[PDB]
A paper describes a structure:
Next, a β-keto acid cleavage enzyme (BKACE)28,29 converts the non-native substrate MSA with acetyl-CoA into acetoacetate and formyl-CoA. The Claisen-like condensation reaction accepts various β-keto acids that react with acetyl-CoA to form an acyl-CoA ester and acetoacetate. In these assays, BKACE15 from Paracoccus denitrificans performed best. BKACE15 forms a homotetramer where each active site is accommodated in a TIM-barrel fold, and consists of eight β-sheets that are surrounded by eight α-helices.
The four monomers of the tetrameric complex are indicated by different colors. Substrate labeling is shown in yellow for acetyl-CoA (“ACO”) and acetoacetate (“AAE”) and in dark grey for CoA (“COA”) and malonate (“MLI”). Malonate, CoA and the corresponding backbone are shown in dark grey, acetoacetate, acetyl-CoA and the corresponding backbone in yellow, zinc (Zn2+) in metal grey, polar interactions in light grey dashes. As previously reported for the BKACE from Candidatus Cloacamonas acidaminovorans, a close homolog of BKACE15, each active site coordinates a single Zn2+ ion. Earlier studies had proposed R254 as a catalytic base involved in the reaction. However, our structures with bound CoA-ester prompted us to revisit the nature of the catalytic base and suggest a different mechanism for the reaction with MSA, in which E171 acts as the catalytic base (discussed in more detail in Supplementary Note 2). Replacing E171 by leucine abolished BKACE activity, while substitution by a chemically similar but shorter aspartate still showed basal activity (5% of the wild type), supporting the role of E171 in catalysis.
Author numbering:
A (entry chain C), B (entry chain D): 3 to 310
C (entry chain A): 0 to 310
D (entry chain B): 1 to 310
The structure:
């Protein structure tokens, strides 16, 4: 398993909105097409949100995932990673239900309460927004992404009972320290899949110093008992992916995180970003991990042990 | 102004509770004695909270500061820094009122929403808590210390109109990036008094790498247009103060931040921690800044241009 | 500006002086093997070729002026790549021997090593000692007392002597002190910006190849030189592509070549220098960046031009 | 646990880099050096780092005989650990440099971990006009000083001096010296706990920026883990800033006129003890305590002050 790089592809998310790009997957069949194409391009893990087909807004209901999860599983042995973040305005009670019902191999777990600033995107996109909800959502200066110590404890206990393991989303140093508290108490066992998230307004930035700081903090707190993945938001996506691959870590791409393929060019598919990451990985002389290798690296329960 | 180190003394705060130490100042006269003693020991800035005299709980009313501010000002020319943090469970609308009414030279300004974990303190102190409010407060696993982007913009505009400048409390990298957003928009003007806070549960830790990361980030984001202060929580108080003093920064001590004088000994006065910091500063060949020197370094309006 | 944003210079160091012929049949030795290696690497995308020469009989380092005569003109006739002539030679050599090729040929670019250091080749004994066919290889790799001499007076001498010929330098910095040494000379005005600073990772006697080492060298160069430098990196051995990727992702330039790394991948020796250039180019293009042309490298590095050399 | 919070102060009383014309307070004669050492120990320095000088012209003297009126005198007056240089002056050969530590078998000797340039000529801008001695001008003006410490040299010193029970203070002037030490440590030529001194601010070595300090510390942490004790040396005006960083980070500190001639703004340091007192004030201001010689011997695993050949 040495020299295997796990590519996670986050195909749609809840931060970008449909008016920002006609390539953002919205319908259930657009999301499954995107996931299947990304897995076939080399993504061992697919990170999934759902959306209302009517207006494209985030949909975190249990039923929203039924036409998504089984469809991808019939076509691909990729590891399906179900969000517990949903949209950052949502409550824990709403957010936990899909992963709780579907008992996936992986679920995201956001490790601290934070501001979430989407209003930067309002300068670029205000003129082309076709839905009022996009204007209100992106303009909201009071978004709080809630993940208290009690909330995280509750998600760890509830979802852990179903065999689900977590992608721990850490947006700044404090989230690694928060994770260390739960690790020391034994509420999660290794190996920890720790994803350091760079470049979001409200989180740490995407400077090389930020990347090395999160890596050296994770090394110190968890030593050998974790696997490192990175998420570089927006135009930082491939720079930070290349840093991680070169440093022994794993890589997240996807239109959830970055709508662009180059300067003034939108990415047309999730698979396209997977191919770019795979080109970097193979250029390093490394190899992209298969789903089976990702399951071994992350000690996952298996694609035949889920509730879909 | 070269080689002057500003010592801020935070005399009581809202995180420690009275059952933890008989030396924690509770009454107005205890708080004013503490402030005057700290300033005479060499603290140029006194950072102030108030408490209910009955049960010692945090009191962020305008009236609670009335027997405090004028008494200190009559005895000392120290810069009085009024909290806008209050207790981390409080709303912005409650927290803003003292600084809004009294128009101080300096007020704290917390730069991001974050978890605040006090339940660790339950390990050492649970057996000696005298008040039920202390059990409920310390045991609360769902504390959200709220400071959204809209919140912070509101405090900046409202208090800046009274001539108040801020001590920007930055508990992790994202808070420096948050501050950069407002600085770039012109909502606060330099020199920025940036206090990097280490070792709180919910914030960055107190490792030397954590200190350098915050310093390097502030240097890159703000260049020469800021003044750096550190707060090392608990047992980290003097180590981190010494790092800052040796690196051209400023220092915060006080029983708000650390109840201890050494292993197994409570600090009896705020002044005693000021004296320890002053011993480090003078050992380095530096000098402790006077209040007038702090006002020049921080571009403050003056101790007699306040509403008390 | 626009024409140079996102352009990554690939330097290819085709043979060097550290690896020895017994270590790989693909190490270029003869003048024509070296020119073939340089031309193929340039055609694969290397804008700069970094050059040493070797004795054709035993493959040992040859830093005579004559050794470069069948090399430089041949490559220039076939490629417009910038030719970077070593002033390092082998680390056992004196300044008086090392300076003569660049002094004579007046290249656009010459390496300039920025500090005296131990140079340990004995890490190569474990893998290679038994297969060494030449006694000179055994004596060289086993030498525990190699001093790679680059005193303050030496570096000043080389700066003055080669600078008079219009040659600009690739400043080879093997640890923090070499950046500080360069800052001393920059402050005295003995070299002018933009400084082409190459930070070298993983050599025994130099800094290692840990990611922290890379960031430390980058941060130090940023603080000392601000905007007035161009950053390149070199990772020894299996660190070569990892460190090239870090630099490309951070706004720097990259060096590959069999002078630095004999491998193409896991369990696979590199058959050509071009192969390593293609791997670096795949990383650069995967990032959405582009490989710089020789003309772009000349502009980025403020070089005198391929028509202004003595060959 | 009883050694928790103890900070070793080493005092380097004269060295070989500063020269007599730079300061009348730089110790030169044997009795000036012993007075300086005893005063520094009494101020709280648990280790004294020693060089000797020719009494006639003040130039570095690394002969065995030069230490004869020094080592026994200090030992009679103080139980401080005596650390004998094997660096001498940076122009000297290994064979000259090794002889005092080989003969006297000290508890501690310096061990410089890599070959490097040594730039003294910046000191000419400040001090050129007051230089009395021809040797001072030609030494400080020499742009070609190579402080030689090859891999072969270091191996030879480790083997020879280790046979006398001497343990080393590994002087690391840049990252590569830590990596060089890691090579010998992995080969078993030195055993822990390694006493690793990171030297900041010399021309030819790493600078004295806070980034340099944390970089050297995080490198030593990664390469040696728990099996080392950290000391710092900040050259010149960085002396107390870098000492304070180390004390606040769990390390130990070196002061002395070997490293810094100054006390403050335009004020020469009058004694070594004065710099020990400043370091001690920082240590005690942190709530830590200065280590005694016995505590330094335990922290550094030294053979004892009665196990030396003087
Ligand atoms: C560093 C050095 C000692 C390494 O020599 P080496 O032993 O041949 O090479 P490395 O150990 O670094 O890498 C080869 C190993 O990594 C593997 N490897 C190489 N490239 C790889 C890749 N892209 N992906 C995965 N593995 C790779 C090989 O399979 C081999 O594995 P093995 O050790 O299990 O057999 C030597 O190459 C060197 O000194 N280079 C610098 C020379 C120099 O100084 N040049 C001048 C600079 S100024
Ligand atoms: C580093 C070195 C070049 C400094 O030389 P220096 O000029 O005598 O000393 P510095 O410049 O560092 O400090 C003196 C200057 O800073 C000021 N200064 C020094 N200490 C100060 C202090 N504690 N507070 C305030 N100012 C101070 C002085 O007033 C003077 O200012 P000025 O330049 O405006 O006149 C030289 O002392 C040296 O090399 N020391 C190390 C020697 C050595 O190698 N030892 C063995 C190492 S293994
Ligand atoms: Zn998501
Ligand atoms: Zn407060
Ligand atoms: Zn070369
Ligand atoms: Zn010495």
């Amino acid at each position: 398993l040495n020299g295997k790089v796990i590519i996670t592809c986050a195909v749609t998310g809840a931060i970008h909105t449909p008016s920002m790009s006609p390539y953002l997957p919205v319908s259930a069949s657009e999301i499954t097409d995107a996931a299947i194409g990304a897995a076939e391009a080399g993504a061992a893990v697919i990170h999934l949100h759902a959306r209302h087909e009517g207006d494209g807004s985030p949909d975190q209901s249990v039923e929203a995932f039924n036409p998504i999860l089984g469809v991808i599983k019939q076509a691909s042995d990729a590891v399906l990673n179900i969000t517990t973040g949903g949209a950052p305005t949502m409550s824990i009670a709403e957010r936990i239900q899909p992963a709780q019902h579907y008992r996936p191999e992986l679920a995201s777990l956001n490790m601290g309460t934070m501001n979430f600033g989407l209003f930067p995107m309002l300068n670029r996109y205000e003129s082309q927004l076709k839905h009022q909800w996009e204007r209100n959502y992106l303009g909201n200066k009071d978004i709080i992404f809630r993940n208290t110590f009690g909330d995280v404890e509750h998600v760890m206990t509830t979802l852990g009972a179903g065999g689900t393991r977590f992608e721990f989303e850490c947006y700044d140093t404090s989230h690694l320290y928060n994770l260390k508290h739960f690790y020391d108490r034994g509420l999660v066992k290794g190996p920890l899949f720790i994803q350091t998230v760079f470049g979001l307004m409200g989180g740490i930035g995407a400077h090389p110093d930020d990347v090395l700081h999160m890596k050296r903090t994770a090394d110190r707190l968890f030593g050998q008992d974790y696997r490192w993945s990175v998420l570089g938001a927006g135009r930082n996506q491939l720079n930070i992916a290349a840093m991680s691959a070169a440093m022994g870590g794993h890589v997240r791409v996807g239109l959830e995180d970055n709508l662009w393929a180059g300067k003034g060019r939108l990415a047309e598919t999730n698979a396209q970003q997977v191919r770019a990451a795979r080109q970097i990985v193979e250029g390093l002389g490394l190899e992209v991990a298969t789903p089976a290798e990702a399951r071994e690296l992350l000690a996952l329960k298996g694609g035949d042990q889920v509730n879909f």
